[PDB]
Paper text:
One central protein involved in the formation of regulatory ribonucleoprotein complexes (RNP) is the coronaviral structural protein nucleocapsid (N). N plays a major role in RNA genome replication, translation, and packaging and has further been found to interfere with host-integrated stress responses and stress granule formation. The N-[name] possesses a peculiar, hand-like three-dimensional fold, with a β-sheet palm and several flexible loops, arranged as fingers around the central β-sheet.
The importance of the central core network is further supported by the mutation of residue Q58. Like the other core network mutations, [name] had a reduced melting temperature. To unravel the structural basis of network-disrupting mutations, we solved the 2.2 Å and 2.0 Å crystal structures of [name] and S105I, respectively. The comparison of our WT structure to [name] and S105I reveals a strongly deformed β-hairpin (basic finger) for both mutants. This is reflected by high RMSD values of 4.552 Å and 3.198 Å for [name] and S105I with the WT, respectively. In contrast to that, the [name] crystal structure reveals a complete disruption of the core network Q58-W108-F171. Interestingly, phenylalanine 171 in [name] is flipped out of its position, demonstrating the propagating effect of one single mutation within the core network.
Numbering used by the authors: 48 to 177
Write the structure that this text describes.
C-alpha cells in the first residue's frame, strides 16, 4: 500500500549510507525547493527472487520525504539505526503530506537520480566494477 516514490539506492558494502550536508535528495521535478528534505531507510526484508529476478544482495536504502513513510513522526536528525537524514539548502522543516508516499499498485517508482556535483557514497558502484 505504501512505498518510496523512488527506486532503491543500493550501497554495495558494510558501510552506512552517507551524504555531505546539503546533498542526497533524489530529483523530483514535481516537487518545490521547500520539499527537498527527508530520510533514507535501509530495507529490512530479504530478496526472495524467482525466475529472472536477480537483484544485488547488498543493502538497499529508500528515500522518504520528511513527515511521510514508516518514520513519518521522526523529527529531522532523529537518531535511529538504518535511518539517515538528507536536506537540500532552502528546504523547510515541515511534513511533506502533499507529496506523501507511492501506492505500488497504481504508480511506478521514479528512477532515483542525484544531481551533478553530488559526492557519491562509498559503495555506490557494485563489487568488481568501480
Amino acid at each position: 500500500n505504501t512505498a518510496s516514490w523512488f527506486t532503491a539506492l543500493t550501497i554495495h558494502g558494510k558501510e552506512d549510507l552517507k551524504f555531505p550536508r546539503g546533498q542526497g535528495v533524489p530529483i523530483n521535478t514535481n516537487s518545490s525547493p521547500d520539499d527537498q528534505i527527508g530520510y533514507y531507510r535501509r530495507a529490512t526484508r530479504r530478496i526472495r527472487g524467482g525466475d529472472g529476478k536477480m537483484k544485488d544482495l547488498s543493502p538497499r536504502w529508500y528515500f522518504y520525504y520528511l513527515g511521510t513513510g514508516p518514520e513519518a513522526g521522526l523529527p529531522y536528525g532523529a537518531n535511529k539505526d538504518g535511518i539517515i537524514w538528507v536536506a537540500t539548502e532552502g528546504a523547510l522543516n515541515t511534513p511533506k503530506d502533499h507529496i506523501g508516499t507511492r501506492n505500488p499498485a497504481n504508480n511506478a517508482a521514479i528512477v532515483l537520480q542525484l544531481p551533478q556535483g553530488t559526492t557519491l557514497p562509498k559503495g555506490f558502484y557494485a563489487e568488481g566494477s568501480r
